[PDB]
């Protein structure tokens, strides 16, 4: 399984994801970005089955980019979460559902920063911190231990690295490299890759 | 030309001012939504047409205002609701639209029957519109307008366009749309508050 | 005389005295075509058609004016022949869908109503014209006996003892009334059906013609067949001598 | 569920219990199982609970459209044949088990309607899970052409024989008496089983539950 | 049991001239807490609430389809909805997708806006209405609060006495359920005010 | 262009519907119906225009159900088409509702079909009118009539065709002095009505009579010798 | 179920039991499995109690509309052919075994058996239902050729009573019907009026 | 048919000098029950083609009215063209193959006999559209119990007379009555010649 | 808008119908004359029920009314299947006038030659609307259609006073049909329907004869 994590602070929505994509026993790509940018200030971290991720997240990326073109202003992160939740929910009763586990993360000029969670059944939940994959089972309790709601963005990188070192020590899959990027009020920056 | 609804934009609210027209005496004075049709929690409208084709145009705007809210869980911005009907009318009545959204603040629009809209600071549609469009262009401080100063302008330009000797205090339907404590309030003003603006005009204009 | 108003451009339009002209104009193509007759006897139904030949190049058997619509029913048409071949193909499909649903040969009182309500159905709409063909239908069975119905382009379907359709339908009917056919047998009327054709044929105007004959009756076990080359030649000799 | 019906020479007496179960635990103690169709035709209901409700309501609207258009009181054979031609079309995929009964101009008629669309016109039927317990009373104590109060005592004894013997039945007995003249919809007819009066006193005092936060929103009058 | 995929524990209880609806706060995948602030009680009027348990993605779908159908109702009719009618509006929303259902079992609780009579209801997953005078429950821990509410419900309760009765029934039922809990939220709907209290619970 | 389709006149008239009533008078025939206290009779002219007609195939009386009778007056091809809907709609009532259709609801079914011809411009009205007779279960005998317009009123006695107006004045006059009828001597009222206005009364094999009674509800067309009994006594 | 139809010279004789079960419980014990399709044509229903009612009510509609158009009493072969085309088109979704017996003026008394699968064959006597298997030897032995109307009634009533005694799915009372030119004569045998063979 | 209800059994067939004789027993089995004992499983298609079928007798009664109406439809238009025995066989191959492709087969197995234009035709059609022509055919357990008796005579004597192939069929019917549980005492042989199709009466084995 | 103006000519040629909204009720009175004594007076009905609480009468063409009385009964039961409440009278007229508008809109179909008067009762408050062939609909206190409706609406305006009860509205409705009757109205020549808290019902002809004694 592939790994997602998000840490919301007072003004930043720090997210990370692995850079590995795997077939059966080999792994095929060593630098695979699983993060899709939708606006200047929101992302969408999508994992799940083969194929359904790049078909759903590209569908949500261009329909939210279509909202910016028709209107000039971009969607809020809350409305982009409910737009993502709306499409994933009403297709799971159709003949072609999607098996994508999402982690949406954006900043808003009025409402502030926001991290969103949904499973493959499209149950949207706003969380201060969330994670996906089998590696979520290890790393949520480092986050349940050391997360204050007012954590600085430099103490959130070191909180992120404690979670990723737990995957190096305890998790059975080789997840050596991670893409890390921050979503403060100035947009989507890109922190240096945490690798081991 | 049937209605006489007019919009006025202010710094802290927009207001529609429609007149209740009753042709025959045996028409029932309806106690329902008469002239100012509320579209969702932060936007209202008014039509220049008969109250049967009003119920087609407003209950189509309310489908668009709730297919948006079902899809994004946010209230619709007060230009996309104007635009989506103007796309439907592009494929036969003129409207006004008052509302508030977080993008461009207090808004006022005017949909042509051809399918064209425009943002107005104050305008009129319906009976004797150009008689009162010209009267608004005389006296409207385009930016220095308070709500009550806009509200006194409404019953000023309605006393020179409708009726005889009382400004039809029980037949004029001012609704104001304000911001208060985060939510959005739409106040169809009551008959006691609508009568006193006639009283505060007939005293101030005679003196 | 003429009318310039459009009360005769559609069959979905009544005239201001209550006539549908496009139906009444459709039975002018029937009233101008050559004569087809049919006489019912005590033991069957005989048809006979004055078949005009229009070119010596046409083979004997072209423009078959006697159809078989089921293995017990015949059909003798008048009028616009291209429309008659379409009402032959409807009468065959109606007779075929009856056996596919009810499992026996279709009665002739009921076949000539399914077809007559197909002809009527085109006399109602502005998109289709009425048929330019009256026609007859004759059958024989142990149950129903001998029956002969005619269908007009209006869609009315009556049952006849003797019938005539075509431009000499008036002169043919007064010859059929000379017959007292309720006592005569089926072979004796093939002599008479062929006799009436040679009488009503105006050899001055119409150049030349073949004679088509077909019975249906108890002498061929109730199936509709073309009269053979021997019995048609004798009836063409008894007529041309008369 | 225990629903029943009988014919009493002047009409139809319909009976039903009130226990609605969700699994093997009692959901509603005062359920209503006798449904309206027309002012002279009611219909008890067993089987799937929603497939009984939304079907008899559909028949009660399709037969009001028949009633207003004909301008006369509907017939029970119409309500039979609307039901059996609908349940057959869904091939038993809607579990409607019905004790349709009513009084029309032809007289008293009572039908049992099975979910696959088979119907059966009897002088006495029972359906439901307690149906076998209630035919014990009708095969023993039914005689043709009874009186009104004699038939009500028969149907109430039949539903009570389903209350005290079926686990998915109980808590009250609903009756419905239809005649040519009247209609007695007797909703608390017999209460065989009541809740016992409690001996202890377990009332939550004020201030027991601690609260984290409390937001109070006053509403306009 | 797909309705135990996310847990859920929603309960309504009728009092005198007031109702009370209560639910838990947990959002969980099969046995894994995700959030502790998941909304299961939705405002459907001035004093009329619905509560949804079951599969948590239909907690959010049915609450938005209904708010879609409620806002069209409240503007076309020109009045607030009667609580007996919202019951049938949910009962047509759930039965329309019968063959393949919304995996939720909603309970509604509100006041009749012209009479202020208390009304509570419960619905099956395919839309079977159920009007009780005492209480209705729904959720993974259904039998646990069936037993707490024929022990504590007395008729004709005061609003401060109703609040203790529904909260002491929610707390002791979700503590005997593994997948329901993480805090309880309680709404007391009265004639003149709505008091929303979330209360101290065991966080598993 | 408001005379070639069924749209309104500036005075508010449908001209094709009015022209369709003139199509009923083109048949040259006339039908008379009358209701008794326990019976219902219909009487037509049976014109045999050709000597080669099988007269058993020329009729205007039709069984619609086992106990609902009909008589069609007007365009003969339109008449057989409107029987076929009454044949269908009366047997479709029995399959959907489990009881015999009333004469109330069969005229209202046929007239609602006929209204659609008077509103869609893509089809003409049928130029023929239907008179349905039958015994109700609770109201006794019924004699109703549809028209090309779509009116389905109920009658004590009615008429149709070329002598419609003249036969009405004969039926109005007898329905004012007495109760218009009694039992199956009501047949004598209708045969005099068609013989007074047409002024022939030549033979007893030139009419066609059908009856429904309370004691026998089924529609039975009277034979020639059965109808000679009422005419020898007339 | 045990149904039976026997042809004589002048008409037919019908017969059925009156028991409809749901497995091993008797839901109805006074059922009427002889349904009138037309005035002189019946069917005997056997098999699925919902399929046979929904087929027979459709053929009563299809034959009733066919008969008023033709203005003749319809053929019994025509009635069974409607059952054939109904049972054959939907035999992937029916369990309806029908035997059709009646009278028509063209060929007298006729018995047609349409079993499951919807073939149609004219038999001199037809037997059907789950209890028909118990009396094949009885009805093949004592069937004379040319029995009277009263003799076919006792031959039907003995043969049904023998199968009701052996089949659990059969039982109840015997419903007999005789269809001839004169009309339909229906009698119901209950109690000691039913034959007992010891 | 997705499940056959009233089945037939082995239909023979053998071509001789100037015609084809096929035979079948007069019996429909409702699953090891001799239920209908007077049914004909051999069809006269037209004057030069005959047809017998095993398998479901209800599906065969459907083919008697589809192929039966199709023969009448060619006789109405009177053009002189009838269907050849190869035409019915090639039509019926397309009918049976189209029904397996809808996964709704006709549960039959036909033997198309025929004599036209101075050739005997004998064609097999299965329920899968499997079609061929052979000097001898036998469906069902006749493919095991009688097709060895037909192929042995047709190797030593490749051309039979009419009486040689008639007694050969009746030798094969008697083996089928002895050794096929679904078989029956009464059968019928039908024969096409230059004269036409002649179905014989209820012949009995002895 | 040409056929719509001409359909109103078919309404204004139709028989008079009068509707008056009282304090606690609505009355719908109309003209049901017969051309001859041969017509059964009680066979067809002009005042006609929709729900238990809604009835409607017409002026104009007879058969076009039955299309609208068959759709208004469907639209009242399509409401009742969904919401399980009797349909508001305001909401019924919005759906009926949408049907009447739907035939003006589509081509090749003439409009209805029918105006409707639609009574009703909801929430303890009476309702009386009028739907035109254009699809327009108006709420009325009292109005009239048919022959001499201009004289009818002026007659109603002099004799209307909103404090009148339902029994006082049946008199002023028959007095409005009295002015343009041209004959002698019996219990059969008119049809009255009243709508109150108990629901809609058309009056039996023996009940009308008590009101004709005034």
């Amino acid at each position: 399984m592939e790994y997602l994590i998000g840490i919301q602070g007072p003004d930043y929505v720090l997210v990370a994801s692995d850079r590995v994509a795997a077939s059966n026993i080999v792994q095929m790509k060593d630098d695979h970005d699983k993060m899709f940018k939708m606006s200047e200030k929101i992302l969408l971290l999508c994992v799940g089955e083969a194929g359904d991720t790049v078909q759903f997240a590209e569908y949500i990326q261009k329909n939210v980019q279509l909202y910016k073109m028709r209107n000039g202003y971009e969607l809020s992160p809350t409305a982009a979460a409910n737009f993502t939740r709306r499409n994933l929910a009403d297709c799971l009763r159709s003949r072609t559902p999607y098996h994508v586990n999402l982690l949406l993360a954006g900043y808003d000029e009025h409402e502030g920063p926001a991290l969103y969670y949904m499973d493959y059944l499209a149950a949207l939940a706003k969380a201060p911190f969330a994670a996906h994959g089998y590696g979520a089972f290890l790393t949520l309790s480092i986050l349940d231990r050391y997360y204050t709601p007012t954590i600085s963005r430099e103490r959130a990188v070191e909180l992120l690295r404690k979670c990723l070192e737990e995957l190096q020590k305890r998790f059975i899959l080789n997840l050596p490299t991670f893409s890390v990027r921050i979503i403060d009020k100035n947009g989507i920056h890109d922190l240096d890759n945490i690798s081991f | 030309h049937a209605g006489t609804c007019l919009g006025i934009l202010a710094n802290d609210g927009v207001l529609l001012a429609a007149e209740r027209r009753n042709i025959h005496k045996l028409l029932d004075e309806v106690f329902f939504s008469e002239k100012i049709y509320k579209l969702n929690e932060d936007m209202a409208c008014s039509v220049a047409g008969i109250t049967s084709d009003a119920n087609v145009l407003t209950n189509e705007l309310r489908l668009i205002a709730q297919r948006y809210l079902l899809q994004y869980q946010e209230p619709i911005p007060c230009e996309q609701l104007v635009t989506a009907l103007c796309d439907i009318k592009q494929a036969g009545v003129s409207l006004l639209y008052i509302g508030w959204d977080k993008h461009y603040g207090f808004q006022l629009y005017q949909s042509d029957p051809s399918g064209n809209y425009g943002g107005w600071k104050a305008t009129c549609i319906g009976n004797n519109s150009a008689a009162a469009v010209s009267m608004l262009k005389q006296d409207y401080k385009e930016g220095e307008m308070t709500l009550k100063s806009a509200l006194a302008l409404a019953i000023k330009v309605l006393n020179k366009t409708m009726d005889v000797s009382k400004l039809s205090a029980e037949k004029v339907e001012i609704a104001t749309l304000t911001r208060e404590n985060g939510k959005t309030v739409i106040r169809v003003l009551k008959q006691k508050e609508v009568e006193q603006l006639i009283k505060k005009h007939e005293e101030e204009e005679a003196k | 005389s003429s009318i310039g108003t459009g009360y005769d451009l559609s069959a979905s339009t009544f005239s201001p005295d209550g006539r549908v002209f496009q139906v009444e104009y459709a039975m002018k193509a029937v009233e101008n075509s050559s004569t087809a007759i049919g006489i019912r006897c005590k033991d069957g139904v005989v048809f006979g058609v004055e078949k005009l030949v229009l070119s010596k190049l046409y083979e004997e058997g072209s423009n078959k004016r006697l159809f078989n619509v089921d293995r017990h029913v015949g059909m003798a048409v008048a009028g616009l022949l291209a429309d008659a071949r379409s009402l032959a193909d409807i009468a065959r499909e109606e007779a075929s869908n009856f056996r596919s649903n009810f499992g026996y040969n279709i009665p002739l009182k009921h076949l000539a109503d399914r077809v007559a309500m197909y002809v009527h159905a085109y006399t109602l709409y502005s998109a289709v014209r009425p048929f330019g063909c009256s026609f007859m239908l004759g059958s024989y069975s142990v149950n129903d006996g001998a029956q002969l119905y005619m269908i007009d382009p209006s869609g009315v379907s009556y049952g006849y003892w003797g019938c005539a359709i075509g431009k000499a339908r008036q002169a043919a009917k007064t010859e059929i009334e000379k017959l007292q056919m309720k006592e005569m047998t089926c072979r004796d009327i093939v002599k008479e059906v062929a006799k009436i054709i040679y009488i009503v044929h105006d050899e001055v105007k119409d150049k030349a013609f073949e004679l088509e004959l077909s019975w249906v009756g108890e002498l061929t076990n109730g199936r509709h067949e073309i009269v053979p080359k021997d019995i048609r030649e004798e009836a063409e000799k008894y007529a041309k001598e008369s | 569920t225990t629903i029943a019906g009988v014919v009493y020479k002047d009409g139809i007496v319909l009976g039903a219990d009130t226990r609605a179960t969700e699994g093997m635990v009692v959901a509603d103690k005062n359920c209503s199982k006798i449904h309206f169709i027309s002012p002279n035709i009611y219909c008890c209901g067993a089987g799937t609970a929603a497939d009984t409700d939304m079907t008899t309501q559909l028949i009660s609207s399709n037969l009001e459209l028949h009633s207003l258009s004909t301008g006369r009181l509907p017939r029970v054979v119409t309500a039979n044949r609307m039901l059996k031609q609908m349940l057959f079309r869904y091939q038993g995929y809607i579990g409607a088990a019905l004790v349709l009964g009513g009084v029309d101009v032809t007289g008293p008629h009572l039908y049992s309607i099975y979910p696959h669309g088979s119907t059966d016109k009897l002088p006495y039927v029972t359906m439901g899970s307690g149906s076998l317990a209630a035919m014990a009373v009708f095969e023993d104590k039914f005689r043709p052409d009874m009186e009104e109060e004699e038939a009500k005592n028969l149907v109430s004894e039949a539903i009570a024989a389903g209350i005290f013997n079926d686990l998915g039945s109980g808590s009250n007995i609903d009756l419905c008496v239809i005649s040519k003249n009247k209609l007695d919809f007797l909703r608390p007819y017999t209460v065989p089983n009541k809740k016992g009066t409690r001996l202890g006193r377990y009332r939550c005092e004020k201030g027991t539950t601690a609260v984290l936060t409390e937001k109070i929103t006053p509403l306009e009058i | 049991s797909i309705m135990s995929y996310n847990g859920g524990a929603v309960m309504a209880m009728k009092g005198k001239n007031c109702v009370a609806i209560a639910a838990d706060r947990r959002f969980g995948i099969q046995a894994q807490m995700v959030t502790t602030d998941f909304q299961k009680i939705f405002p459907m009027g001035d004093r009329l609430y619905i509560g949804l348990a079951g599969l948590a993605t239909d907690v959010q779908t049915v609450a938005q389809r209904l708010k879609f159908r409620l806002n069209l109702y409240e503007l076309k009719e020109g009045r607030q909805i009667k609580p007996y009618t919202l019951m049938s509006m949910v009962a047509n929303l759930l039965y329309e997708k019968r063959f393949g259902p919304y995996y939720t079992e909603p309970v509604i609780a509100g006041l009749d806006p012209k009479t202020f009579k208390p009304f509570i209801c419960s619905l099956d997953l395919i839309g079977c209405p159920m009007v009780t005078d005492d209480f209705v429950v729904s959720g993974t821990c259904a039998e646990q609060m069936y037993g707490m509410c024929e022990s504590l419900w007395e008729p004709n309760m005061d609003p401060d006495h109703l609040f203790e009765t529904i909260s002491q029934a929610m707390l002791n039922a979700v503590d005997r359920d593994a997948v329901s809990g993480m805090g309880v939220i309680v709404h007391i709907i009265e004639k003149d005010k709505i008091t929303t209290r979330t209360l101290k619970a065991r966080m598993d | 262009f408001d005379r070639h389709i069924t749209i309104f006149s500036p005075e508010g008239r449908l001209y094709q519907v009015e022209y369709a009533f003139k199509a009923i008078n083109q048949g040259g025939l006339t039908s008379v119906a009358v209701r008794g206290k326990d019976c219902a009779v219909i009487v037509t002219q049976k014109k045999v225009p050709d000597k080669l007609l099988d007269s058993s195939t020329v009729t205007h009386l039709f069984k619609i159900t086992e106990n609902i009778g009909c008589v069609m007056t007007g365009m003969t091809a339109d008449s057989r088409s409107q029987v076929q809907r009454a044949r269908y709609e009366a047997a479709n009532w029995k399959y959907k509702y489990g009881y015999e259709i009333p004469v109330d609801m069969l005229c209202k079914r046929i007239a609602d079909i006929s209204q659609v011809y008077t509103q869609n411009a893509e089809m003409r009205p049928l130029g023929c009118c239907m008179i349905l007779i039958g015994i109700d279960e609770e109201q006794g005998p019924q004699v109703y009539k549809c028209d090309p317009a779509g009116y389905y009123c109920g009658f004590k006695a009615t008429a149709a065709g070329v002598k419609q107006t003249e036969s009405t004045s004969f039926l109005e006059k007898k329905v004012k002095k007495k109760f218009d009828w009694t039992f199956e001597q009501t047949v004598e009222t209708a045969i005099t009505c068609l013989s007074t206005v047409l002024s022939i009364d030549f033979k007893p094999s030139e009419i066609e009579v059908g009856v429904v009674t309370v004691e026998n509800p089924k529609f039975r067309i009277l034979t020639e010798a059965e109808i000679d009994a009422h005419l020898v006594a007339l | 179920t045990t149904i039976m139809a026997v042809q004589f010279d002048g008409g037919v004789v019908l017969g059925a039991d009156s028991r409809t079960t749901t497995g091993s419980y008797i839901a109805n014990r006074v059922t009427d499995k002889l349904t009138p399709i037309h005035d002189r044509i019946f069917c005997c229903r056997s098999g699925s109690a919902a399929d046979t009612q929904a087929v027979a009510d459709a053929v009563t509609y299809q034959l009733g509309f066919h008969s008023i158009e033709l203005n003749e009493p319809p053929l019994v072969h025509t009635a069974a052919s409607l059952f054939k085309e109904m049972c054959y088109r939907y035999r992937e979704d029916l369990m309806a075994g029908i035997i059709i017996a009646g009278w028509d003026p063209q060929e007298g008394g006729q018995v047609y058996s349409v079993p499951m699968g919807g073939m149609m064959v004219r038999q001199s006597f037809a037997i059907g239902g789950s209890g028909s298997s118990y009396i094949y030897g009885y009805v093949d032995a004592t069937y004379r050729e040319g029995m009277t109307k009263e003799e076919c009634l006792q031959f039907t009533a003995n043969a049904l009573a023998l199968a009701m005694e052996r089949d659990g799915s059969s039982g109840g009372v015997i419903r007999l019907a005789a269809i001839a030119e004169s009309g339909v004569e229906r009698q119901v045998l209950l109690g000691d009026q039913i034959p007992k063979f010891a | 048919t997705q499940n056959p209800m009233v089945t037939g059994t082995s239909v023979l067939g053998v071509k001789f000098e100037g015609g084809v004789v096929i035979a079948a027993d007069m019996l429909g089995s409702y699953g090891s029950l001799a239920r209908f004992r007077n049914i004909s499983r051999i069809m006269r298609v037209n004057n030069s083609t005959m047809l017998g079928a095993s398998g479901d007798y209800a599906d065969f009664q459907y083919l008697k009215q589809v192929l039966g109406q199709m023969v009448i439809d060619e006789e109405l238009l009177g053009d002189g063209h009838s269907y050849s025995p190869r035409a019915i066989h090639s039509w019926l191959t397309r009918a049976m193959y189209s029904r397996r492709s809808k996964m709704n087969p006709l549960w039959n197995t036909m033997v198309i006999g025929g004599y036209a234009d101075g050739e005997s035709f004998l064609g097999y059609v299965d329920m899968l559209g499997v079609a061929y022509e052979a000097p001898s055919l036998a469906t069902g357990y006749g493919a095991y119990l009688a097709q060895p008796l037909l192929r042995e005579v047709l190797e030593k004597q490749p051309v039979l007379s009419q009486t040689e192939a008639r007694d050969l069929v009746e030798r094969c019917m008697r083996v089928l009555y002895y050794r096929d549980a679904r078989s029956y005492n009464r059968f019928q042989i039908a024969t096409v010649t230059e004269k036409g199709v002649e179905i014989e009466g209820p012949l009995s084995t002895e | 808008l040409v056929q719509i103006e001409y359909a109103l000519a078919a309404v204004a040629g139709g028989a008079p119908s009068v509707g008056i909204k009282a304090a606690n009720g609505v009355v719908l009175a109309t003209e049901k004359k017969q051309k001859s004594i041969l017509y059964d007076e009680r066979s067809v009905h002009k005042v006609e029920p929709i729900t238990k609480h809604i009835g409607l009468v017409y002026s104009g063409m007879g058969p076009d009314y039955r299309v609208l009385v068959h759709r208004a009964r469907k639209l009242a039961q399509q409401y009742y299947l969904v919401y399980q409440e009797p349909i508001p009278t305001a909401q019924l007229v919005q759906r009926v006038a949408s049907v009447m508008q739907e035939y003006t809109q589509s081509g090749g179909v003439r409009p209805f030659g029918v105006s409707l008067l639609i009574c009703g009762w909801n929430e303890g408050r009476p309702y009386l609307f009028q739907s035109d062939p254009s699809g327009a609909y108006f709420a009325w206190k009292a109005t009239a259609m048919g022959k001499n409706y201009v004289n009818g609406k002026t007659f109603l305006e002099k004799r209307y006073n909103e404090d009148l009860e339902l029994e006082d509205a049946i008199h002023t409705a028959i007095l409005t049909l009295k002015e343009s009757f041209e004959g002698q109205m019996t219990e059969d020549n008119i049809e009255v329907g009243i709508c109150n808290e108990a629901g809609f019902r058309r009056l039996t002809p023996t009940e009308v004869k008590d009101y004709l004694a005034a």
Side-chain angles (χ1 to χ4, degrees), chain G residues 118-139 141-144 146-149 151-181 183-191 195 197:
Chain G
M119 62 166 279
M120 181 185 69
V121 67
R122 185 178 179 182
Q123 281 179 341
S124 178
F125 62 96
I127 319 96
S130 66
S132 64
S133 67
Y134 297 137
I135 52 173
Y136 275 106
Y138 180 75
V139 305
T142 185
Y143 179 74
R144 302 177 66 248
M147 299 190 289
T148 64
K149 177 177 181 290
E151 189 175 2
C152 292
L153 283 168
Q154 291 185 358
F155 169 66
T156 305
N158 288 318
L160 291 175
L162 286 170
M164 289 163 60
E165 187 70 22
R166 291 287 184 179
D167 194 4
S169 295
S170 298
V173 301
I174 295 171
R175 292 188 184 274
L176 298 172
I179 298 170
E181 185 178 2
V184 181
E185 295 177 351
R186 299 184 73 181
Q187 59 182 356
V188 178
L189 299 179
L190 63 94
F197 281 163

Side-chain angles (χ1 to χ4, degrees), chain B residues 102-111 113 115-126 130-133 135-138 140 143 145 147 149-158 160-162 169 172 174-179 182 184-190:
Chain B
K102 63 186 179 182
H103 299 91
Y104 297 113
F106 293 107
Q107 301 180 5
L108 176 58
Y109 292 99
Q110 178 184 357
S111 67
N116 290 314
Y117 63 94
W120 294 94
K121 295 185 177 71
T123 184
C124 299
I125 50 170
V133 168
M135 190 177 175
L136 289 169
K137 290 185 284 187
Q138 295 178 1
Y140 178 73
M145 186 61 66
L147 182 65
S149 176
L151 190 58
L153 177 57
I155 45 93
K156 181 176 173 68
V157 303
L158 286 171
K160 300 294 182 182
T161 190
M162 289 307 291
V172 172
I174 307 104
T176 61
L177 186 146
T178 56
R179 295 287 286 165
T184 302
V185 188
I186 296 173
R187 293 179 187 271
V188 178
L189 294 176
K190 296 178 183 179

